[PDB]
C-alpha cells in the first residue's frame, strides 16, 4: 500500500517575486513489486502541464519515493487557488488525489515587538534578543535576524502558535555576545508575510 | 492487523508527588473475529503485574479498543527506566512490543527570564508579558502564569524548540489589560522541570 503527502511552497518563496514557489507532491513506499507511477496536476480543476516529475530517491529501509514538483504563480497561490495532485499507478485500481491551498481567511498583518535582554541575563557572556511577532494570519511567515545589513547566525525561531483571538504569534531569539550588545550594535528582526506592505517589515533593537 | 500505541505520562505527573504518573498502552483495530487481547508489562525487562486493564470498548467503526494503564513510580520514570508493553493475539503472527522511557541525556536546568512589553505596545488596550525559558534538557516541561497566587488564564506557550547548543527553549506569552500592568500589578511565571530545585521555579514580572 502506497501513500501521498501534498506540500505547500515556502512562505518566503511566494512573497518574493525573485523566487520560484513550488507544490511538492510526495509518494512514499513505492515497492519494487510495482515501481511505476504517474502524476496529473490541477489548478481549480484545470489540468496543467508545467510539472517536473523528478526521479526517484532510494531509501534505507527498502522503500522508494517518487516526487512531482509544480511551479506556481505567486498571485495564484496568494489568491488561494486549490492545487490538486492526481496520482496514478497500476498498484492502485483507483487514482489517489490530494488537494491543498493557502489557508483561507482574512490576512492579518503581524505586529513586531523586539525585546531587550533581561537584567538577570547580563550575568552571562552571551545574551538573548527577543522578537515578538503576533496577530498574523495565515500562519505562513518568515523571520530573520540581521545586523548592519548582514545576517545573524545564532538565531532560532519557534513555530507559529494559534493564539486566543484566532490569529498567530511566534517568537525569535537571537543570541549574541554581551559584548556586541553593550557596545551599542543595532539589530533587526526582519519579518516576511503576505499582509505586510511590500510583504516585509523590519524592527530595530539596540541598547541606546 | 491491529495497531499499538504507548503514551508516556504528562511531565507535571512525574514532577509532582501530588500527582500520579502513568504509562498508557492503547490497542486499536482489534478484530471482531479474533477479539481477545493480552497485555504483558515489563519495566527494564522485569515483568510487573500492577497494570490495570480497562474493559474492551466497541468502536463505531466495528473494531475494538482496549486500554492498559500501568502506574509508575516518580523516581522510576525520572531515573529513566524502560517500560515495555507486550500485546498478544492469535490474529498476530507474533506479539507486538512497544517500549518507552524518559529522554536519555544529561538534564539541564532551565534559565527563566521575564521580559516586559515593548513600549510600542502601550497603544493597545491589552499588553504582552513574556517568559523566556531557555537551556533546559530534557524538553519535558510545564509553564504556568499566575498573579497574587491565583492562576492566570489568557496565556499561550510555544512548543519547546531545539536550540543551537543541544538544549531547549520556549516562550510563554501572557496577555493582560493595559490597566492591570500599569497599576503596578505583579505577575508570576512558574516553571516545572526535573532539573529545578523542588522541580519548580517562579519568576516575577512587575512595573516599577
Ligand atoms: C476505529 O476507531 C478508533 C477510534 O476512533 C474513535 O472512535 C470511533 C468510535 C469514532 O468515534 C472516531 O470518530 C473516533 O476518533 C481508531 O483509532 C485511532 O487509530 C489511530 C491509528 O490508526 C490512532 O492514531 C494515533 O494517535 C496518536 C494520538 O492519539 C492521542 O491523541 C488523539 C488526538 O490526536 C486522541 O484522539 C487519542 O485518543 C489519543 O489520546 C491520548 O490518550 C492517551 C492515553 O489514553 C493520553 O496519555 C493522552 O493525553 C491523549 N493525547 C491526546 C493528544 O489527547 C498519535 O500520536 C499517533 O501518531 C503517531 O503515529 C502516526 C501513524 O501511526 C504518525 O504519523 C505520527 O506522527 C506519530 O508517529 C509517532 O510519533 C512520535 C512522536 O512524534 C514518535 O515518538 C513515535 O515513534 C511515532 N510512532 C509511530 C509508530 O508512528 C497516531 O496517529 C488514534 O489515536 C486512534 N484513535 C483513538 C481514539 O484510539 C481506529 O483507527 C478506527 N479504525 C478504523 C480503520 O476506522
UniProtKB/Swiss-Prot annotation, chains A, B:
Entry keyword annotation includes S-adenosyl-L-methionine: no
Source organism superkingdom: Eukaryota
Domain Ig-like: 2-101, 110-206
GO biological process: adaptive immune response; antibacterial humoral response; antibody-dependent cellular cytotoxicity; B cell receptor signaling pathway; complement activation, classical pathway; complement-dependent cytotoxicity
Pathology noted in the entry: Multiple myeloma: A malignant tumor of plasma cells usually arising in the bone marrow and characterized by diffuse involvement of the skeletal system, hyperglobulinemia, Bence-Jones proteinuria and anemia. Complications of multiple myeloma are bone pain, hypercalcemia, renal failure and spinal cord compression. The aberrant antibodies that are produced lead to impaired humoral immunity and patients have a high prevalence of infection. Amyloidosis may develop in some patients.
Keywords for the protein's UniProt record, in alphabetical order: Adaptive immunity, Cell membrane, Chromosomal rearrangement, Disulfide bond, Glycoprotein, Immunity, Immunoglobulin, Immunoglobulin domain, Membrane, Secreted, Transmembrane, Transmembrane helix
Residues of the full protein shown: 120 to 327 of 399
Glycan attachment residues as annotated in the record: 61
Entry GO MF terms: antigen binding; Fc-gamma receptor I complex binding; immunoglobulin receptor binding
A GO CC term attached to the entry: immunoglobulin complex, circulating
Quaternary state and interactors: Immunoglobulins are composed of two identical heavy chains and two identical light chains; disulfide-linked. Interacts with FCGR1A; this interaction mediates IgG effector functions on monocytes. Interacts with FCGR2A and FCGR3A.
Disulfide partners: 25-85, 131-189
Biological role: Constant region of immunoglobulin heavy chains. Immunoglobulins, also known as antibodies, are membrane-bound or secreted glycoproteins produced by B lymphocytes. In the recognition phase of humoral immunity, the membrane-bound immunoglobulins serve as receptors which, upon binding of a specific antigen, trigger the clonal expansion and differentiation of B lymphocytes into immunoglobulins-secreting plasma cells. Secreted immunoglobulins mediate the effector phase of humoral immunity, which results in the elimination of bound antigens.
Region (CH3): 105-208
Result of changing residue 122 to M: In IMGT allele IGHG1*03
Protein name: Immunoglobulin heavy constant gamma 1
Region (CH2), start-end ranges: 1-104
PTM statement from Swiss-Prot or TrEMBL: Glycosylation on Asn-61 is required for interaction with Fc receptors and ability to activate the complement pathway. (Microbial infection) Deglycosylation on Asn-61 by S.pyogenes EndoS or Endos2 endoglucosidases prevents interaction between immunoglobulin-gamma (IgG) and Fc receptors, impairing ability to activate the complement pathway.
Amino acid at each position: 500500500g502506497p501513500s501521498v503527502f501534498l506540500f505547500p511552497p515556502k512562505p518566503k518563496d511566494t512573497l518574493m517575486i525573485s523566487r520560484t514557489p513550488e507544490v511538492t507532491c510526495v509518494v512514499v513506499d513505492v515497492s519494487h513489486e510495482d515501481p511505476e507511477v504517474k502524476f496529473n496536476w490541477y489548478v481549480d480543476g484545470v489540468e496543467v502541464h508545467n510539472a517536473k516529475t523528478k526521479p526517484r530517491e532510494e531509501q534505507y529501509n527498502s522503500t522508494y519515493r517518487v516526487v512531482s514538483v509544480l511551479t506556481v504563480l505567486h498571485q495564484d497561490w496568494l489568491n488561494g487557488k486549490e492545487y490538486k495532485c492526481k496520482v496514478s499507478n497500476k498498484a492502485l485500481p483507483a487514482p489517489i488525489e490530494k488537494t491543498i491551498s493557502k489557508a483561507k481567511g482574512q490576512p492579518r498583518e503581524p505586529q513586531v515587538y523586539t525585546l531587550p535582554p533581561s537584567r538577570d541575563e547580563l550575568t552571562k557572556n552571551q545574551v538573548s534578543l527577543t522578537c515578538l511577532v503576533k496577530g498574523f494570519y495565515p500562519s505562513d511567515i518568515a523571520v530573520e535576524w540581521e545586523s548592519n545589513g548582514q545576517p545573524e547566525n545564532n538565531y532560532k525561531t519557534t513555530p507559529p502558535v494559534l493564539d486566543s483571538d484566532g490569529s498567530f504569534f511566534l517568537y525569535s531569539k537571537l543570541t549574541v555576545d554581551k559584548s556586541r550588545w553593550q557596545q551599542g550594535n543595532v539589530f533587526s528582526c526582519s519579518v516576511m508575510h503576505e499582509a505586510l506592505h511590500n510583504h516585509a517589515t523590519q524592527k530595530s533593537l539596540s541598547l541606546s
